[PDB]
Amino acid sequence: MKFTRVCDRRDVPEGEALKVESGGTSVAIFNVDGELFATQDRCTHGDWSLSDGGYLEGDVVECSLHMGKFCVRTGKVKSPPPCEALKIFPIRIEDNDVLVDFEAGYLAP
Amino acid sequence: MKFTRVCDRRDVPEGEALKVESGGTSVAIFNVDGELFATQDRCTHGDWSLSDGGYLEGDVVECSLHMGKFCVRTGKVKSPPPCEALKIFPIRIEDNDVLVDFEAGYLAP
Ligand code: FES
Ligand code: FES
């Protein structure tokens, strides 16, 4: 229902992440093999940025504070310490523009 | 709504309760004669868990701290001290999977 233009698709190279924020909501955008995926930026186990850490392997991001891991496509936990999945956010690409609905974060089924 | 799997229905036997949570949102799931009902986990009168510190008799849960009571089907108060109804949450059963939408808590009319 409410998409916000956050960056150019070329701002998130394959295998990298980018933090974007709006209204006090922080979202991490990951580029996995040419497609973009959005999740809450903070690890669910602490106030620690998943994008600012720099550890993405394929579609699994690793929190650099305690090594927890999450699937960026679904937000699901792949390794503890975390026990809670990340919220994921609607993300669309229109031309070279990447848009995110910061008010629609949700947990994957 | 965006439903997420929170437990197996067999994890909440008849007459029992189970707490599930995501971020700061805690939900109590109660089994009343085979059907599951979801409410906020905390008593509205204090930081006290209705699933961990509640006694379920039929469809009425009693807060063990001051003996306030709520109907788990509607969240409405059945006995003081509480004066505010519990928020209730949408819950679905798909085979043996139990799903809730943590962002959709509401007050019964
Ligand atoms: S804060 Fe991320 S694993 Fe602990
Ligand atoms: S905290 Fe539940 S009745 Fe007071």
UniProtKB/Swiss-Prot annotation, chains A, B:
User: CDD domains, per this entry?
Assistant: Rieske_RO_ferredoxin (cd03528)
Q: Which GO MF term does the entry hold, naming one? A: 2 iron, 2 sulfur cluster binding
Establish whether keyword DNA repair is in the entry. no
The protein's UniProt keywords, in alphabetical order, are:
2Fe-2S, Aromatic hydrocarbons catabolism, Electron transport, Iron, Iron-sulfur, Metal-binding, Transport
List ligand-binding residues for [2Fe-2S] cluster. C43, H45, C63, H66
User: Which residue intervals define the domain Rieske in the entry?
Assistant: 4-100
Top-level taxon: Bacteria
* Record GO biological process: catabolic process
**What does the record note on quaternary structure?**
This dioxygenase system consists of four proteins: the two subunits of the hydroxylase component (BphA and BphE), a ferredoxin (BphF) and a ferredoxin reductase (BphG).
Family, per the entry? Belongs to the bacterial ring-hydroxylating dioxygenase ferredoxin component family.
**Function description:** This protein seems to be a 2Fe-2S ferredoxin.
- PANTHER family from the UniProt entry: 3-PHENYLPROPIONATE_CINNAMIC ACID DIOXYGENASE FERREDOXIN SUBUNIT (PTHR21496:SF23), FERREDOXIN-RELATED (PTHR21496)
> What is the protein name stated in its UniProt record?
Biphenyl dioxygenase system ferredoxin subunit
Q: Which organism is it from?
A: Paraburkholderia xenovorans (strain LB400)
